[PDB]
Design a protein around this ligand. Structure first.
Ligand code: CA
Ligand code: CA
Length: 682
């Protein structure tokens, strides 16, 4: 992605840029054959400017020449060499500026080459190994000045990202790599960006770096748009836990039987601020014999303590990767009882933590909080009262900071992306947060995904130089909504299948906009609602009920019923159905009941911890197993007029402890009838 940077103009005076691109060698030509996305009238180039550096591998005297010296002025550093021998020294970098003007060319495109001749009189087009791009960064480097010589033309590029002011403001496209003005009736993505922000989203990648692919390949595709922020978002996923009674100096004997408690866990990133937090649910379903308390199970007295181990992974749901610092996490019981601080070793990561991925990767083992080969893992200890609290709440919280370490950035000297020790996420995130609107959307699998989109702040003059951002456009560019036939959709689902919720400031702002639009319904004017910096917008699938963490925990009876209508097979052994994956996510289990002729009901799996009777098969269909908690026996129906009733239990209606009186039965559980057939119908 290296060479000289070229601006090719339709007018004579460097005002109407048609193509911005880079060469590889001194051949700076663009044939008309490559100009499909330029209309023919504007393929006539009357002026051009090139910029970059020349690197010398042999100290010598050199003569520069082009294909059109009578139309050219060229500077090496501040020195005009065309408008002649110049001594250049090995190991040194010289700035190049070339301008070309030719009125009324008769051919489209441009045939243009840059040559040099050494002392041996050998003339050649300059090799790619001798040419570098300009330093299109916010600061110069030790060897590479960020501005070109003042002599000659200065194409307006107030932020030094390489994209001319006029294209950033008026609209541009990139084609396979030609950057050109966007023209409705020919074109491809329409980009606009701020001509005064090197990164319009205030992230660490320039607007030009994003649209030309001069960027970390791990940056999410949507964040190659100059108006979508590229930044990591990390939380911790806990997969399972094991609780152990701590040994004490008094117990000399360590030969005792296994008395640990092992449970699966389910973790979700939450939204209730710019914090990273996830909430863990400890499974309440049957795992051990008896119906003992956890203390009875593990042999804990009131003066004993217990410890927890667990398997975890880190999850990046953001748009940029992390390389050398994983964030620190606090493991919290109840509201504010910190049980552990979880850290990884800085500068010793075994892999990248990339967007839409895990650390460790899912094809590798997870991390154990107390690793078998770590002598120095701190025991995560609870006192007896804390242990009882965990038994009752079956909940933990993982609060993760935003300490993400160093950033891999592009270097124009060599075209490489490398971790830059001088660039840190902690210097970048505050400004992303301050200048963007935040949308949290759960249409991908019901988990909360945050994106930030550049948006004007009317009260910050710099931020008013950014383009207007509508709500519709933000959903398209940040989340991949599309609009086939007028209607805005996400993966086939109309936008009207999702609700809108806002913070208090954002809500008043939107309400005022709708009033100025005399619009009674936001869904019909999404192209006219403008976002502003610091808005917070939460968009959720309407089929579901949500808890205080905005985790999906249930759904209307009508929705759940309809989701279970399509029965494939029924028998005394169970039911086989096709159920939407999203529905399965909000269920904790099923209750199976036999109803006799007088209306009395026998619940088969009549325990709060015996509802986990469904499984997903390879075919993707669900089996509800009547036998599992019926002693591996099918249901015995003593009269064909008896009914088999099956009920679904949503998570919000799930009982996770015996009742106050000790009753472990299902009496009182709010449950949704989803199947009811007589024996002769089975
Ligand atoms: Ca610019
Ligand atoms: Ca810019």
């Amino acid at each position: 992605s290296q060479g000289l940077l070229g601006y090719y103009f339709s007018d004579l005076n460097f005002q109407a840029p048609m193509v911005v691109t880079s060469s590889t060698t001194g051949d700076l030509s663009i044939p008309s054959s490559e100009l499909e996305n330029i209309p023919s009238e504007n393929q006539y180039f009357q002026s051009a400017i090139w910029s970059g550096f020349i690197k010398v591998k042999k100290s010598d005297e050199y003569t520069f020449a082009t294909s059109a010296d009578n139309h050219v002025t060229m500077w090496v550093d501040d020195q005009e060499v065309i408008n002649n021998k110049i001594r250049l020294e090995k190991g040194r970098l010289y700035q190049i500026k070339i301008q070309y003007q030719r009125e009324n060319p008769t051919e489209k495109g441009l045939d243009f080459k840059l040559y040099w001749t050494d002392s041996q009189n050998k003339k050649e087009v300059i090799s790619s190994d001798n040419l570098q791009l300009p330093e299109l960064k916010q600061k110069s480097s030790n060897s590479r000045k960020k501005r070109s010589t003042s002599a000659g033309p200065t194409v307006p590029d107030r932020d030094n990202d390489g994209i001319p002011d006029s294209l950033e403001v008026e609209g541009y496209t990139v084609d396979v790599t030609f950057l050109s003005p966007y023209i409705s009736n020919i074109h491809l993505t329409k980009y606009k960006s701020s001509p005064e922000k090197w990164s319009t989203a205030s992230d660490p990648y320039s607007d030009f770096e994003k649209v030309t692919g001069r960027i970390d390949k791990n940056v999410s595709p949507e964040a190659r748009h100059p108006l979508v922020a590229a930044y990591p978002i990390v939380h911790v996923d806990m997969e399972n836990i094991i609780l152990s009674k701590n040994e004490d100096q008094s117990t000399q004997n360590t030969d005792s039987q296994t008395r640990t408690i092992s449970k699966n866990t389910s973790t979700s990133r939450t939204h209730t601020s710019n914090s990273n937090s996830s909430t863990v649910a400890i499974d309440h379903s049957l795992s051990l014999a008896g119906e003992r308390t956890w203390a009875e199970t593990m042999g804990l007295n009131t003066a004993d303590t217990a410890r927890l181990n667990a398997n975890i992974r880190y999850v990046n749901t953001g748009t940029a990767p992390i390389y050398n610092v994983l964030p620190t996490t606090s493991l919290v019981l109840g509201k504010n009882q910190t049980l552990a601080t979880i850290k990884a070793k800085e500068n010793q990561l075994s892999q990248i933590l990339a967007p839409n991925n895990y650390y460790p990767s899912k094809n590798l083992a997870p991390i154990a909080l107390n690793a078998q080969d770590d002598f120095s893992s701190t025991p995560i200890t609870m006192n007896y009262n804390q242990f009882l609290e965990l038994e009752k709440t079956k909940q933990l919280r993982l609060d993760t900071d935003q300490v993400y370490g160093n950033i891999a950035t592009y270097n124009f000297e060599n075209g490489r992306v490398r971790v830059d020790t001088g660039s840190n996420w902690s210097e970048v995130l505050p400004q992303i947060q301050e200048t963007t609107a935040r949308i949290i959307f759960n249409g991908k699998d019901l988990n909360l995904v945050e994106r930030r989109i550049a948006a004007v702040n009317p009260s910050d003059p710099l931020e008013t130089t950014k383009p207007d951002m509508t709500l519709k456009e933000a959903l398209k560019i940040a989340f991949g909504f599309n609009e086939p036939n007028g209607n805005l959709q996400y993966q086939g689902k109309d936008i009207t299948e999702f609700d809108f919720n806002f913070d208090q400031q954002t809500s008043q702002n939107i309400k005022n906009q709708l009033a100025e639009l005399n619009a009674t319904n936001i869904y019909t004017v999404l192209d006219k609602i403008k976002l502003n910096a610091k808005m917070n917008i939460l968009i959720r699938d309407k089929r579901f009920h949500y808890d205080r963490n905005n985790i999906a925990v249930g759904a209307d009876e009508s929705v759940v019923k309809e989701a279970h209508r399509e029965v494939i097979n029924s028998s005394t052994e169970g039911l086989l159905l096709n159920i939407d994956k999203d529905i399965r996510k909000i269920l904790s289990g099923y209750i199976v009941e036999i109803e006799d002729t007088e209306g009395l009901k026998e619940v088969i799996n009549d325990r709060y911890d015996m509802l986990n009777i469904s499984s997903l098969r390879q075919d993707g269909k669900t089996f509800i197993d009547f036998k599992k908690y019926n002693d591996k026996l099918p249901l015995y129906i003593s009269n064909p007029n008896y009914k088999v009733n099956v009920y679904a239990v949503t998570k919000e209606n799930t009982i996770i402890n015996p009742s106050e009186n000790g009753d472990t039965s299902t009496n009182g559980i709010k449950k949704i009838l989803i199947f009811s057939k007589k024996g002769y119908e089975i």
